[PDB]
Amino acid sequence: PDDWVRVMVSVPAPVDEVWEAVTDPRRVAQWFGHLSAPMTTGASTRVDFGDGDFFDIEVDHVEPRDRLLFRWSFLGVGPECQVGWTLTGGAEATTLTVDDSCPGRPGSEVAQLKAGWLDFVGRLARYLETGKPSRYDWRQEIDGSVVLPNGSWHPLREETVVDWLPIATNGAGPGWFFVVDEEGPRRFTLRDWQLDRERALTFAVEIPGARTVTACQVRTEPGERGRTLSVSHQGWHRLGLSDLQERTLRHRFAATWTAALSLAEECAR
Ligand SMILES: [Cl-]
Ligand SMILES: [Cl-]
Ligand SMILES: [Cl-]
Ligand SMILES: [Mg+2]
Ligand code: NA
């Protein structure tokens, strides 16, 4: 499987207050993320979390003090999800119901997505209670996905990984991972490369100065809709570096993975 995530929160605020909190961009930025423009019927917008993560949004309907219906794509490359935020007033509280569906969603994604929406509605409730910002500053793990056609090119082959990953060999076997932007470091040591052809890829990326290594898992899951290529890159919060160093690394690597997923989509065309 059931791709349809449904989450609810009940808050002791009136419907009009909750509606403002989920539509006014100044308020939305206190608990959810930064909107490039308010949601408007038939118009596109974008929400940015300040850490490299974002969704591109197309808004289908805005019904005041009732509901928001929109579609979005994680990092601009993920499959389109149908999202609904619906308010129901009560004698005790206002209920916000979140619907998030996506045809063919891997069952492996559903639990993470439910937890993600429970986090977001928990931040809404905190902001309504205290008036203080309840945003997270940066998310401790990187993830993303893109749906590829069921074609002849596959991203998880020794002879295709260099087509889309920012890696180079170091003797014989991938040994460097590159983050190419206007900051540094640019070159990172890659260790423990393990490729299970057309199934899964794991490796570690060392961070200069850090107390532990980061861990990367790439997988493909077949489906009627196409092959879902997914990445998880973890460890940023346990590097033993300053928070700004950890956040900056996470942000830069998130942009790198966004570019890699896009390139894989181009290769699979
Ligand atoms: Cl292989
Ligand atoms: Cl596959
Ligand atoms: Cl942890
Ligand atoms: Mg944590
Ligand atoms: Na934090």
Author numbering: 9 to 277
Question: Which lines from the publication concern this structure?
Answer:
The final model included 269 protein residues, 282 water molecules and five ions. The N-terminal (residues 1–139) and C-terminal (residues 150–283) domains are connected by a flexible ten-residue linker (140–149). Assessment of the C-terminal domain suggests divergence from the canonical START/Bet v1 fold observed in the N-terminal domain. The opposing region of the cavity is composed of aromatic residues, including Phe57, Phe63, Phe82, Phe128, Trp80, Trp125 and Tyr144. The abundance of aromatic residues localized in one region of the cavity suggests a possible role in carbocation intermediate stabilization if cyclization is catalyzed in the cavity. The cavity-forming residues frequently reside in loops or β-strands, potentially increasing cavity flexibility and enabling contraction and expansion to accommodate substantial substrate rearrangements.
Here, we report, at a resolution of 1.5 Å, the crystal structure of DynU16, a putative di-domain protein homolo­gous to StAR-related lipid-transfer (START/Bet v1-like) domain-containing proteins. While an actual enzymatic assay is needed to confirm the speculated function of DynU16, we conclude that it is likely that this protein participates in the biosynthesis of dynemicin as a cyclase or perhaps at least as a dehydratase of an extended or cyclic ANQ precursor.
